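Why do we bother with a discrete structure alphabet at all? Because it lets us treat a fold like text: something you can write down, compare, and reason about line by line. To make this less abstract, here is a complete entry for Cysteine dioxygenase type 1. Read it the way you would read a sentence in a foreign language you are learning: slowly, and without expecting to understand everything at once.
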Amino acid sequence: TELLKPRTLADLIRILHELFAGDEVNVEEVQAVLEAYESNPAEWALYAKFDQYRYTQNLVDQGNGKFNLMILCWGEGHGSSIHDHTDSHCFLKLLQGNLKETLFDWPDKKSNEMIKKSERTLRENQCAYINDSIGLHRVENVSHTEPAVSLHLYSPPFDTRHAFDQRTGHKNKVTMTFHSKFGIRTP
């Protein structure tokens, strides 16, 4: 349980494998180690594959089945749907740029607009945490000039989640589509 500063991305991944070797996770320790990793673009450029039209999800490591570790690349103006996290822990560390995270309450079975609970800006090298008991969220790169790159860890891994219509609260089941896996484009 001795958390050292990850010297590299490879080191971070090794430490994460040790942290998830049990059956339950220490959320605060995982968040601390992710925040302590100093983003170094040389180490993660292989995974930072952008698309012109929307954010991409690039698988880095499958954590021996305990977690999905992925890098998301947000072009200028790119944002996500309002999403849940399928009963998983979700960590979001900024590797480059800034992202706006907006929190929503779970909807009531009445078709109403979903009203924001709070919003915050995530800055380079910060690590944020969310799960379904905190609420739903949308993530957006509101910059006109700067792409954003984030490192996400989800445990347990999930292949599907829900997207929520902000105007009505109605939800749709959606499949996680990976732009690449282990540095290899996967159309």
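What the structure line is telling us, in plain words: DSSP finds three helices and 13 strands in the chain. Residues 9-19 form the longest helix (11 residues).
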